[PDB]
Amino acid sequence: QSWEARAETYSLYGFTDMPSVHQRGTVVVTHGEGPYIVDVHGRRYLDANSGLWNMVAGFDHKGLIEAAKAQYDRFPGYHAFFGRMSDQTVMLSEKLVEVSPFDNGRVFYTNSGSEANDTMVKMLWFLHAAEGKPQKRKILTRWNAYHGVTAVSASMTGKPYNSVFGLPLPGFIHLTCPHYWRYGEEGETEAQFVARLARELEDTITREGADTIAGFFAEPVMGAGGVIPPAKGYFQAILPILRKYDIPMISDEVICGFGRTGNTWGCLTYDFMPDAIISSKNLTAGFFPMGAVILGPDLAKRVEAAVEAIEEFPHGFTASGHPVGCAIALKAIDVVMNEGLAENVRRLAPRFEAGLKRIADRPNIGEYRGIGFMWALEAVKDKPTKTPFDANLSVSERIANTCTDLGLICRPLGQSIVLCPPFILTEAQMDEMFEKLEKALDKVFAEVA
Amino acid sequence: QSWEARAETYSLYGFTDMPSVHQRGTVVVTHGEGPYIVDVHGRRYLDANSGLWNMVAGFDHKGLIEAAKAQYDRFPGYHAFFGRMSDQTVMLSEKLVEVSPFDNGRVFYTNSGSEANDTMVKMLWFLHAAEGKPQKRKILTRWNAYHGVTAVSASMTGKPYNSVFGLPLPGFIHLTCPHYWRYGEEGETEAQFVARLARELEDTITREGADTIAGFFAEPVMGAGGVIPPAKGYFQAILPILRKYDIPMISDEVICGFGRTGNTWGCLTYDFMPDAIISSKNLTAGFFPMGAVILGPDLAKRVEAAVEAIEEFPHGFTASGHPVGCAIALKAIDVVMNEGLAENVRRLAPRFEAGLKRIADRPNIGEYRGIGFMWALEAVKDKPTKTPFDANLSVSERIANTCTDLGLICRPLGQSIVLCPPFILTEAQMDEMFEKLEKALDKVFAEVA
Numbered sequence: 001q002s003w004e005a006r007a008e009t010y011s012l013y014g015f016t017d018m019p020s021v022h023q024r025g026t027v028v029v030t031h032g033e034g035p036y037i038v039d040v041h042g043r044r045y046l047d048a049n050s051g052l053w054n055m056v057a058g059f060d061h062k063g064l065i066e067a068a069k070a071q072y073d074r075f076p077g078y079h080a081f082f083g084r085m086s087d088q089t090v091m092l093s094e095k096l097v098e099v100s101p102f103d104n105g106r107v108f109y110t111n112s113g114s115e116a117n118d119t120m121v122k123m124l125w126f127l128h129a130a131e132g133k134p135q136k137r138k139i140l141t142r143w144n145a146y147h148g149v150t151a152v153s154a155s156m157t158g159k160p161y162n163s164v165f166g167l168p169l170p171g172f173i174h175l176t177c178p179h180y181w182r183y184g185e186e187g188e189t190e191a192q193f194v195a196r197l198a199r200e201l202e203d204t205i206t207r208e209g210a211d212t213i214a215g216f217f218a219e220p221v222m223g224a225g226g227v228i229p230p231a232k233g234y235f236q237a238i239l240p241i242l243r244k245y246d247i248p249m250i251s252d253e254v255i256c257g258f259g260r261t262g263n264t265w266g267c268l269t270y271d272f273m274p275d276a277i278i279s280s281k282n283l284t285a286g287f288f289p290m291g292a293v294i295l296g297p298d299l300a301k302r303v304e305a306a307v308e309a310i311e312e313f314p315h316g317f318t319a320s321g322h323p324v325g326c327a328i329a330l331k332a333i334d335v336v337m338n339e340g341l342a343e344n345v346r347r348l349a350p351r352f353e354a355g356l357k358r359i360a361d362r363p364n365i366g367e368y369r370g371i372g373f374m375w376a377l378e379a380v381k382d383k384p385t386k387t388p389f390d391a392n393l394s395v396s397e398r399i400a401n402t403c404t405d406l407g408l409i410c411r412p413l414g415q416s417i418v419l420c421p422p423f424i425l426t427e428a429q430m431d432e433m434f435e436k437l438e439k440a441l442d443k444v445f446a447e448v449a
Numbered sequence: 450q451s452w453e454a455r456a457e458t459y460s461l462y463g464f465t466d467m468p469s470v471h472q473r474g475t476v477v478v479t480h481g482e483g484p485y486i487v488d489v490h491g492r493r494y495l496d497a498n499s500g501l502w503n504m505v506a507g508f509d510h511k512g513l514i515e516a517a518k519a520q521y522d523r524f525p526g527y528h529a530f531f532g533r534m535s536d537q538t539v540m541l542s543e544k545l546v547e548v549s550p551f552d553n554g555r556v557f558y559t560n561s562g563s564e565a566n567d568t569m570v571k572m573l574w575f576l577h578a579a580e581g582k583p584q585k586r587k588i589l590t591r592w593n594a595y596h597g598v599t600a601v602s603a604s605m606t607g608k609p610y611n612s613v614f615g616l617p618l619p620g621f622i623h624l625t626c627p628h629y630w631r632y633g634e635e636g637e638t639e640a641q642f643v644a645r646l647a648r649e650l651e652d653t654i655t656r657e658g659a660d661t662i663a664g665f666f667a668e669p670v671m672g673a674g675g676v677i678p679p680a681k682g683y684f685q686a687i688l689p690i691l692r693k694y695d696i697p698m699i700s701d702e703v704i705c706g707f708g709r710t711g712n713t714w715g716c717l718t719y720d721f722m723p724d725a726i727i728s729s730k731n732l733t734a735g736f737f738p739m740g741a742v743i744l745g746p747d748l749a750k751r752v753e754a755a756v757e758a759i760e761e762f763p764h765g766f767t768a769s770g771h772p773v774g775c776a777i778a779l780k781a782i783d784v785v786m787n788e789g790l791a792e793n794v795r796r797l798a799p800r801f802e803a804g805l806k807r808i809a810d811r812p813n814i815g816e817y818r819g820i821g822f823m824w825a826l827e828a829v830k831d832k833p834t835k836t837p838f839d840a841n842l843s844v845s846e847r848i849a850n851t852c853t854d855l856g857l858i859c860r861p862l863g864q865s866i867v868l869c870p871p872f873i874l875t876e877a878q879m880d881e882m883f884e885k886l887e888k889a890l891d892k893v894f895a896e897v898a
């Protein structure tokens with residue numbers, strides 16, 4: 001019984017290309033060092049995807065390892081219901097409101113980012129109903145958005161593949177993605193593009209009626225949708241319209257939270273104030289499953305009041321507010337902001353951007369894009385016309401597979417080659433990643449020209 | 450700035466009475482010992498609730514503590530997507546199929562039971578759609594059922610409190626609860642009761658159309674709905690009907706999995722064979738957030754064939770199949786099943802019954818119920834007629850409160866008192882539990898009767 005065999009026999013794989021995994025075998029990982037992972041055959045890889053955006057401190061950070069173990073020595077498990085919670089919970093809440101852009105606020109916990117978005121929607125429904133508008137339920141997101149995998153968070157996610165579940169559910173509207181390169185019109189400037197989306201939102205609000213719309217969620221920079229920075233002035237045009245019609249604005253900071261963008265929050269980087277923040281991933285540097293909904297002052301007041309009218313918030317997850325996870329997050333927050341990880345991103349962003357600009361030079365890259373330590377190259381069959389490769393060429397898989405074969409974990413989402421390495425990444429490691437990526441590109445584009 | 454005050458300030462409370470957490474100190478917890486917890490001032494309490502059903506090994510178990518720590522030392526975090534996963538992940542999937550009632554099958558990972566129920570539903574929509582019936586979407590559960598708090602899992606839950614959210618969503622149907630004592634009609638026997646719910650199921654299927662019904666979910670014994678064993682023969686009547694009409698049966702084993710009913714699974718205790726299992730909570734003895742969906746032979750083959758047709762299953766949570774969680778799970782499973790914990794439940798269940806049997810003697814306990822290490826006492830004003838006390842006497846929230854005063858954590862649910870202590874409980878600690886409870890009951894029934 002090999003590892004590959006055992007894996008195939010018992011696993012139902014999620015987000016796994018099945019013809020790749022049948023033909024190649026599951027890669028079974030035993031440990032890591034810095035930004036490297038090592039499999040059971042001893043084969044070693046530079047994971048330029050931070051595992052899954054979240055391992056910003058690498059795969060063996062001593063401080064974080066030591067922090068987790070200490071909390072298990074102290075108090076290994078508990079909950080946050082019935083008027084009881086850990087000291088460690090009370091601590092993170094306090095810490096989180098502080099690092100947040102809000103002056104004061106409140107914090108509710110989940111296990112995943114998906115749960116947090118799901119919770120956020122329910123909070124909105126609860127809130128508008130208690131404030132006299134039970135019909136105020138619709139949820140606005142963007143095409144290419146990714147907000148998670150529960151029925152609701154998947155309805156929030158703007159991707160063709162949710163049709164296999166018969167989603168989105170009624171009440172979830174997808175507006176145009178602010179990706180200027182893809183969706184900008186013949187001879188339309190970036191400013192004209194941003195004005196068209198401001199206009200498109202208002203039309204939607206007119207079409208549906210503000211009294212039926214409960215919220216607007218946005219990632220500051222779109223992550224799993226393939227690293228899409230917003231067109232210039234998007235949030236500046238977008239927010240006032242939402243204030244005008246009394247539509248809560250929620251910032252999904254699950255990827256942008258704590259550093260990847262060049263700041264503590266994506267909404268800092270793009271200079272807007274949300275009514276609430278959804279945080280996860282980096283929150284624990286992938287050491288423990290944690291999610292957080294951070295309500296800004298206005299929603300905090302309103303939710304709090306709404307609760308006391310009824311006497312209980314009948315919502316919550318078994319492991320939410322976990323002593324271990326809260327401890328880890330404190331340490332992770334401290335490590336990122338005070339032990340140089342976030343600054344490392346700001347420092348190396350210029351060089352990272354220089355590498356991609358060099359790489360984008362060839363016939364089959366349409367553009368490069370991103371910010372800080374989150375970036376993507378777009379593969380095209382024809383550059384002038386912007387036309388993608390045929391589905392049957394499986395260009396995405398070829399690139400992933402070839403990268404893996406050269407010792408580089410790089411995961412393309414669609415025809416968007418994504419790079420989101422840990423923050424602990426050294427200039428030499430960054431060179432390693434580029435050199436490996438380039439070879440992969442040469443090989444694949446020549447197979448496929 | 451006290452602990453109580455810093456708690457109130459930054460925290461949003463889940464499943465918490467606000468009139469009594471504002472009234473009494475918000476209890477902040479530092480550590481534990483065996484089945485006892487210690488707060489920030491130094492008071493000890495016997496937790497007859499295993500934290501939240503899940504701390505079956507107690508709060509300071511040596512082995513689990515070291516297993517958790519050992520894994521942080523070896524590989525503190527990863528994911529299970531894109532053709533990769535940790536060695537821990539593969540061992541756990543193997544061990545879950547073995548330890549489950551299924552001979553063979555497949556495992557999908559979540560962080561919580563709510564996530565896992567939400568997932569199972571999505572799987573069913575996916576599967577039936579792939580097999581040519583996209584309208585097969587409706588989900589059957591029972592009144593009083595508890596399945597989670599995501600929009601979908603809360604819709605599955607049969608509790609009036611979800612109306613604050615405008616839930617249940619369309620498609621979610623609650624059958625009568627199999628609680629003979631409460632829902633048995635005058636003169637009607639238990640055998641007749643079951644016969645009637647059987648008829649109700651078939652009438653519901655006939656009326657909706659079997660092609661529109663995606664699955665049937667049940668807790669073998671209902672937990673957070675107040676510890677309810679099914680009327681005798683229920684699952685023996687329910688199953689044949691579900692099979693006659695091609696409706697997948699899912700056993701929600703989130704509370705009942707791994708020992709609490711006196712067997713490895715609730716479904717073994719009640720001698721029925723489901724099509725898939727939802728597991729969480731005890732899986733990690735509460736040490737880590739983990740959920741699992743274990744598909745039996747038929748649904749495994751069928752889901753895999755559907756995934757295969759489209760080449761990728763577009764579902765998964767970032768922390769799914771986490772290396773630490775799996776390593777911890779793997780250890781909890783071993784501790785419960787091989788180190789006496791499950792066995793101790795069987796050893797002490799008749800003594801547990803004997804205690805409640807005596808307590809239920811009072812004119813104010815209307816009934817005891819449960820099995821293994823999960824029990825309820827139901828409070829009543831008049832025993833002959835089964836009328837409860839008036840709601841405004843908060844007769845349960847008192848017993849819970851005066852219990853906490855006496856050093857016993859005990860959860861009130863409606864008019865009933867719930868006990869589900871850790872599996873490690875000694876005979877002496879069990880008697881301490883009864884001692885402290887009888888005193889609480891004496892004090893509260895004196896006042897209220």
Ligand SMILES: [NH3+]CCCCC(=O)O
Pocket residue numbers: 015052224413767
């Ligand atoms: N956070 C999970 C990323 C999922 C990637 C995909 O859409 O293929």
Ligand code: NA
Pocket residue numbers: 097098099100101102103104
């Ligand atoms: Na702040």
Ligand code: NA
Pocket residue numbers: 546547548549550551552553
């Ligand atoms: Na088995």
